[PDB]
Amino acid sequence: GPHDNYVTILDEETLKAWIAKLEKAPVFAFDTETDSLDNISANLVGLSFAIEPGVAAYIPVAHDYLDAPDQISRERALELLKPLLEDEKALKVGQNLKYDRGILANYGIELRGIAFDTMLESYILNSVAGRHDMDSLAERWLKHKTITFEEIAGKGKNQLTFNQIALEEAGRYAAEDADVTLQLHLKMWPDLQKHKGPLNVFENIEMPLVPVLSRIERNGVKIDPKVLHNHSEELTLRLAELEKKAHEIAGEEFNLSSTKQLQTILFEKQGIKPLKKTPGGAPSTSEEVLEELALDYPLPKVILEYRGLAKLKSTYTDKLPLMINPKTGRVHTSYHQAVTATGRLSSTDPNLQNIPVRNEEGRRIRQAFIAPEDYVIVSADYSQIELRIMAHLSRDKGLLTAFAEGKDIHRATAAEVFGLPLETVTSEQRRSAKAINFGLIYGMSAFGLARQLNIPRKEAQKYMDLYFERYPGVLEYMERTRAQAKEQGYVETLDGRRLYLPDIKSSNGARRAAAERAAINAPMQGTAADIIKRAMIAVDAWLQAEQPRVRMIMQVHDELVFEVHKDDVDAVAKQIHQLMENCTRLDVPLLVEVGSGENWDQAH
DNA sequence: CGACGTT
Ligand SMILES: [Mg+2]
């Protein structure tokens, strides 16, 4: 791990020399460092170029501390770099490219040279290794503890924004970052080349996602804060009523939110035997315990209602109005592309993928999302996608025929399990088969179904036996995947995304069963994520080539909520439809139930 | 309720 060959650029002539080197440089790093953690309101501070291993350059453009000398104009430097950054033939490399690209696009410079991202490379190679962050990557691959931002800043309010930070420390840190990316690239890229499936997915599914991810995050979803600042008042009043009722039942004032106090007061005053126990050993008070106890006493019911209301209020109705970006008035999310192992995108700060649906008050919370003016929400959706991947990967004629004909999968499964035809499949049989399908997706055991269906576990096993006998190809494929995990350990999805299992041969019964379940459902969710990502890429290509009156705002799991102008709804819905069924060459069709509701809940 | 685990 070399160092000290780090030249910091203060004059534009050295910048010209560096760009002359860069335009002949095949691959090079790019790591813009910025004061603000935000990707939208942040103002750029400096850049970083590392054409050759150890040969890294930091280019300050605005430093705020006393006597920051010869600061190149942030506009002049970017104007001189526009031929380079906006070049397609120059392949770049970095970390979290949807951050650098967003920061650059703040100034109108649309970057186009992205080809490698160390985060994405580390994700594709071994998705269950570390956390895919520079600090972890450093020792995990290069075996070189790098300088963190904490040393320069210091935890707490004492932490310093990067812009006023002294020249030497900031420059050496950024150049070390750039240089590191190069070492990580030069080390991992041969490994990424040796793996054909991972190479395919990395080139075609993961990396073209970065520009559309940045565009989606910068577009942001619009919320009507008045709805939440109204609705929280009714939430507070209702929970106050629940407080009054609970303190009437118990005769004392306390906090329903606390769990230790709640279990103590409950199990000492009313004294029901603890049905279940927490993983920590204490008596458990989860929702099942709540409903079982509310079968007997009203205080469990009222505290369950308090939990239900308070969770949604505190998590959404209070946090979302706070997170509205004041500059543009739209909530901006950070889709972390590589954090979950399976492959799904997971929105963070705030979790837009975690908006309530099943509760009517959750329906109100989803109604809080609206359109600015003359616009209307289009909520794309894949219906029962996981079962479609199951049919494709099982090669079972029954499910393939059922999906090709287009009948509801749940009633068809119930018909094939119980014998009576699908038209006579009633509601209880229907959601019984629904539980069968979902559980088989997740790999759960018969006790789980006795819990999720309130039927004896013997009857659960009998029902799965009927299903398994009528669908032997699915079981054969699942056993093939289980066995494949033994000698390969990287049970793999369709498009080549892998998952290394360090728990397949753990020789422990507890871990291996969960490892087997993960091996079962890994191709499932992996294929679903790849299909969604490819649909995202195609739709983004359509918008960026045609520029219609549509803006993609969010990507929930198997959902692609848009925002269209009122007069476009007739044709753009059909166009995105066609773009999405033609997304992936899979035999079973990919049904897309496009809504066109005025608000997100209405479109849902 | 049945398979996994240990004294
Ligand atoms: Mg970076």
Determine the Cα–Cα distance for residues A474 and A43; give it in Å rounded to an integer: 54
Q: How was this structure determined?
A: cryo-EM
Determine the Cα–Cα distance for residues A491 and A344; give it in Å rounded to an integer: 17
CATH number at residue A41: 3.30.420.10
Task: Please confirm whether the linkage preceding A69 is cis (ω < 30° from 0).
Answer: no
Domain-located, residue A124: yes
Domain-located, residue A584: no
CATH number at residue A462: 1.10.150.20
Distance (Å) from CA A508 to C1' B4?
10
Q: Which domain holds residue A272?
A: 225-348
CB A432 within 8 A of CB A412: no
Q: Which protein residue has its CA closest to C1' of B3?
A: A509
**Which tokens is A577 given?**
């439809």
Q: Is A505 helix (H, G, I), strand (E, B) or coil?
A: coil
Residues A266 and A191 in one domain: no
Q: What is the CA radius of gyration of chain A?
A: 27
Determine the Cα–Cα distance for residues A463 and A527; give it in Å rounded to an integer: 28
CATH number at residue A253: 1.20.1060.10
Residues A87 and A75 in one domain: yes
The torsion of the CA quartet A74, A78, A81, A87, rounded to 10 degrees, works out to: 150
Last residue of one domain, picked from the residues A172, A201, A221: A221
Which nucleotide's C1' is closest to A457 (Cα)? B1
Domain-located, residue A365: no
Name, in order, each residue with C-beta under 8 angstroms of A234's C-beta and a sequence gap of 6 or more. Answer: none
Q: Is A53 helix (H, G, I), strand (E, B) or coil?
A: coil
Residues A274 and A191 in one domain: no
Residues A263 and A410 in one domain: no
CB A517 within 8 A of CB A374: no
- Amino acid (1-letter code) at residue A291: E
**Which tokens is A228 given?**
């939440």
Handedness of CA A578, A582, A587, A591 (dihedral sign): negative
Length of chain A, in residues:
604
Determine the Cα–Cα distance for residues A448 and A471; give it in Å rounded to an integer: 20
Distance (Å) from CA A446 to C1' B1?
10
Beta bridge partners of A283: A277
DSSP A368-400: TB--SSSEE--B-BBSSHHHHHHHHHHT-HHHH
Residue from A50, A4, A3, A59 nearest A30 by CA:
A50
CA A312 to chain centre: 20
Going by DSSP bridges, is the β-strand pair A44-52/A33-34 parallel, antiparallel, or unpaired? antiparallel
Residue numbers 446-505 of A with CB closer than 7 A to any atom of strand B: 447, 456-458
Residues A238 and A195 in one domain: no
Domain-located, residue A599: no
* Helical ranges in A126-272 per DSSP H: 134-137, 149-153, 167-194, 196-201, 209-219, 225-250, 259-269
Phi and psi dihedrals of A453, rounded to 5?
-135, -10
Residue from A533, A96, A123, A116 nearest A338 by CA:
A123
Angle at A354 between CA A211 and CA A133, to 5 degrees: 50
Residue from A354, A350, A356 nearest A320 by CA:
A350
Name, in order, each residue with C-beta under 8 angstroms of A252's C-beta and a sequence gap of 6 or more. Answer: A265
- What is the three-state SS of A277-318? ECCCCCECCCHHHHHHHHCCCHHHHHHHHHHHHHHHHHHHHC
Residues A61 and A189 in one domain: yes
CB A50 within 8 A of CB A57: yes
Domain-located, residue A372: no
Name, in order, each residue with C-beta under 8 angstroms of A240's C-beta and a sequence gap of 6 or more. Answer: none
Beta bridge partners of A44: A34
- Amino acid (1-letter code) at residue A126: N
CB A432 within 8 A of CB A425: no
Determine the Cα–Cα distance for residues A337 and A407; give it in Å rounded to an integer: 34
**Which tokens is A38 given?**
């935000």
Which helix (H) or strand (E) segment is A7 a member of? strand A6-8
Determine the Cα–Cα distance for residues A389 and A402; give it in Å rounded to an integer: 13
Domain-located, residue A378: no
Residues A143 and A99 in one domain: yes
Residues A45 and A174 in one domain: yes
Domain-located, residue A541: no
CB A62 within 8 A of CB A163: yes
Residues A200 and A270 in one domain: no
Q: List own/partner pairs for A203-209 with CB under 8 A and 24 or more apart.
A: A204/A495, A204/A534, A205/A495, A205/A497, A205/A530, A205/A533, A205/A534, A205/A537, A206/A120, A206/A123, A206/A124, A206/A337, A206/A338, A206/A533, A207/A114, A207/A115, A207/A116, A207/A117, A207/A120, A208/A537, A209/A337, A209/A533, A209/A536, A209/A537
Last residue of one domain, picked from the residues A293, A327, A348: A348
Question: Does A508 contact strand B, using a CB cutoff of 7 Å?
Answer: yes
Distance (Å) from CA A294 to C1' B4?
33
Phi and psi dihedrals of A325, rounded to 5?
-70, 120
Which nucleotide's C1' is closest to A508 (Cα)? B4
Residues A511 and A408 in one domain: yes
Which helix (H) or strand (E) segment is A402 a member of? helix A397-405
CB A49 within 8 A of CB A41: no
Last residue of one domain, picked from the residues A495, A528, A561: A528
The count of structural domains within chain A is 3
Question: Does A507 contact strand B, using a CB cutoff of 7 Å?
Answer: no
- What is the three-state SS of A311-360? HHHHHHHCHHHHCCCCCCCCECCEEECCCCCCCCCEEECCCHHHCCCCCH
Residues A144 and A29 in one domain: yes
Residues A156 and A234 in one domain: no
Residue from A121, A144, A13, A25 nearest A70 by CA:
A13
Question: Does A53 contact strand B, using a CB cutoff of 7 Å?
Answer: no
- Amino acid (1-letter code) at residue A579: L
Distance (Å) from CA A519 to C1' B3?
21
Domain-located, residue A291: yes
